Structure 1
Amino acid sequence: KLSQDEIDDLKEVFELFDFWDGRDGAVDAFKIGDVCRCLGINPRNEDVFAVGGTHKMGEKSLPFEEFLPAYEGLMDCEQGTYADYMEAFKTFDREGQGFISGAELRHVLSGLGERLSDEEVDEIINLTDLQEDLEGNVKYEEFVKKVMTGPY
């Protein structure tokens, strides 16, 4: 199933993360999610836990061979579509015009689901250049597209 092209990318990334926790041929089980994110997949935290991800640095460490199957197991995780995202945000849109207030945007991002930190929230709003208007409203559809299409 896994293209050799893909196995190569996994090695490259694996070695980067190996280096970054102390070169020794193993990546911390806590960084499992991030390796995979670098490879272009978007697992929920609950996914990476199901494949062996730990809650904290220093509990377990994986050599490449134990890591490959973790990756293969997340690779098929469910990923949100744009339609799903719009439906979700629409439940917070009070008049269905396409706006949501910035405070609400922050409530859903750091108060629901797998809650993101204030720092993480401020950063995605920064990177996506999402501005609110004079009454504190933002268009969730722009934000959704910017996040989906990625940093490049």
Structure 2
Amino acid sequence: GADQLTEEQIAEFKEAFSLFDKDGDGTITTKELGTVMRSLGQNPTEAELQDMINEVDADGNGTIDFPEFLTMMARKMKDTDSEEEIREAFRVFDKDGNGYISAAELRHVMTNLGEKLTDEEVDEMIREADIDGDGQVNYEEFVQMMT
């Protein structure tokens, strides 16, 4: 849902993040999250606070940065949020929007993104990611292509 947030919503979330981030180091700790929760009448344990962070902790460093905070504010988990971002990346290559990346689409978009590969490199990239062997890369294959 983080992709559906408006500009004013994001600007308000920036103000909120700054109030959570007491020491201004750009990350929210369990200590900082706990302060906020208790100001709102809750008493989460340290384990419950760490779990709130883990649910959005895409990089696994144990703290919330602002992109992860946007996941939290959209009331989403990190797995759904990452799937939204992978699907956005997929759509960049799927120029004709049919749900499959062709060799010509991969060559075209990679070229315009500054990496001009030979026709042989593109065919090789397609074949390696093409699991079901239909000659194209669907979304589920695109995810494994990126791991």
Return the TM-score normalized by structure 1: 0.32
> Larger Cα Rg: Structure 1 or Structure 2?
2
Question: Which has more strand, going by share of residues?
Answer: 1
Give the TM-score normalised by structure 2.
Answer: 0.33
Higher helix share: 2
